[PDB]
Amino acid sequence: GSFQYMKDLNKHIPFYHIEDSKFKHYGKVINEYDFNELETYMDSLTIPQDQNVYVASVTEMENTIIKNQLQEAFYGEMSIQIGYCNGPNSTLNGLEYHKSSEINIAITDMVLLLGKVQEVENNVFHSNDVIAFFVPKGTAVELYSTTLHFAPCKVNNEGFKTIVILPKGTNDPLSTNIQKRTKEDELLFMKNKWLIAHPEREQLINKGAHPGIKGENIKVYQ
Amino acid sequence: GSFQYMKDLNKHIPFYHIEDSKFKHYGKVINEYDFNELETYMDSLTIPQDQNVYVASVTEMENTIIKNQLQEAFYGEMSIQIGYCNGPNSTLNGLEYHKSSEINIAITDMVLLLGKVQEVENNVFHSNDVIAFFVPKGTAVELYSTTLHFAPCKVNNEGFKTIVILPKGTNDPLSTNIQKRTKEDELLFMKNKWLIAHPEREQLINKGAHPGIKGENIKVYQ
Ligand SMILES: [Cl-]
Ligand SMILES: [Fe+3]
Ligand SMILES: [Fe+3]
Ligand code: NA
Ligand code: NA
């Protein structure tokens, strides 16, 4: 099916299924929960064709039995938000991390281009360290805090839909302009979000993102 | 030198300095902040001789410039608490993680026994996967969310003192009794804290901890 097709089209990058043991360094597949209340909301959305969209916190999705289950158990009673990231993207563009776990639920098939925070050296990450993981429709994953990640890359021509679950407030605008002291301070970009942008990605550079991906702006062919 | 003395006494454990590059898999050494406000408070304490003490949130230590600096920059605007863990312990006892970053600042020399969350299999962690890191007085470290850790082990006969900084609420008592569904739900122990206890530690098992460390309850000799 789509997995083998995509693997064949992407021999320029290491390209694995999300169920591969290689994913274990980056996160965990979550199997025990069902997400019908969230799927219902996501069915009412359209995928944008001009650029990706991200909404960090959606009342409809947070006002659900499943959000309470995930807050009290998966996040150990820390307050969460549930949003979405949908779009037409096929390129790496940037890599971010949070000092928290993220859940991504694939509402369509999609690909995640991932890295490790430990592979950042002096605010540079090399494209040649990226690994791609094919995530089938319906699979939920935890991305660990040490996993660099960004918007998905599409599998179907029509683009992708994903649910994104984070501690409440993550990705909100910064309310203060810190006096930068550490290397990582150069990467802080939104609340609980550190970002390394590809220099060829003008949409990020124009917002003041730190240019730090060295290498190709990887494309996922489909 | 205390480091080489301790390394020589602990050849049964892989034993490294916190400045060793191996620690970069588990966290980061924090170098550009000034913790003098907190050091002043910690100098006013002695070390308990009978058992460890952990106080999660100390108002005086949170009403500091450093607290604001670390909240707005290191934690990217997410609310934090500042407390301490001091005591006479020399054994592994347990291994915990949070889905957040922790800062430990060594007020005395101390040793951290660490593991990786990805090395847990069916809620078991093997003692032979533990690594020890010697942390000199004055060093501050970030422990990543994927780093299993617990209370320090002492270097000096008098015990150790450490500052512990976490997202606000971490380690509070759980307010809900979840339906257990995932393996990790068996480990949830306090707010934002999952614990794998050594089966010999009744102090932990009696409080509801999951016995899951297979192997010796490692002792750090000094
Ligand atoms: Cl990791
Ligand atoms: Fe993210
Ligand atoms: Fe901890
Ligand atoms: Na499970
Ligand atoms: Na329990």
Numbering used by the authors:
A (entry chain B), B (entry chain A): 2 to 223
What did the original publication write about this model?
Bacillus megaterium encodes a functional sulfo-SFT pathway and the corresponding gene cluster contains a DUF4867 family member, SqvB, with 51% sequence identity with E. rectale SftX. B. megaterium SqvB adopts an α/β fold with a central, characteristic β-barrel and belongs to the cupin superfamily (cupin from latin cupa, a barrel). The role of DUF4867 family members in the sulfo-SFT pathway has not been determined.
The structure was initially solved using 1.5 Å resolution diffraction data in tandem with 2.3 Å selenomethionine data, the latter collected at a wavelength to optimize the f″ signal from the selenium anomalous scatterers. Native and SeMet-labeled SqvB crystallized in the P3221 space group with two molecules in the asymmetric unit. These results were corroborated by quantitative inductively coupled plasma-optical emission spectroscopy analysis of BmDUF4867, which detected Fe and Zn in a solution of the protein. Based on the XRF mapping and X-ray diffraction datasets analyzed for the anomalous signal above and below the Fe absorption edge, the metal was modeled as Fe at an occupancy of 1 at the center of the β-barrel in both subunits.
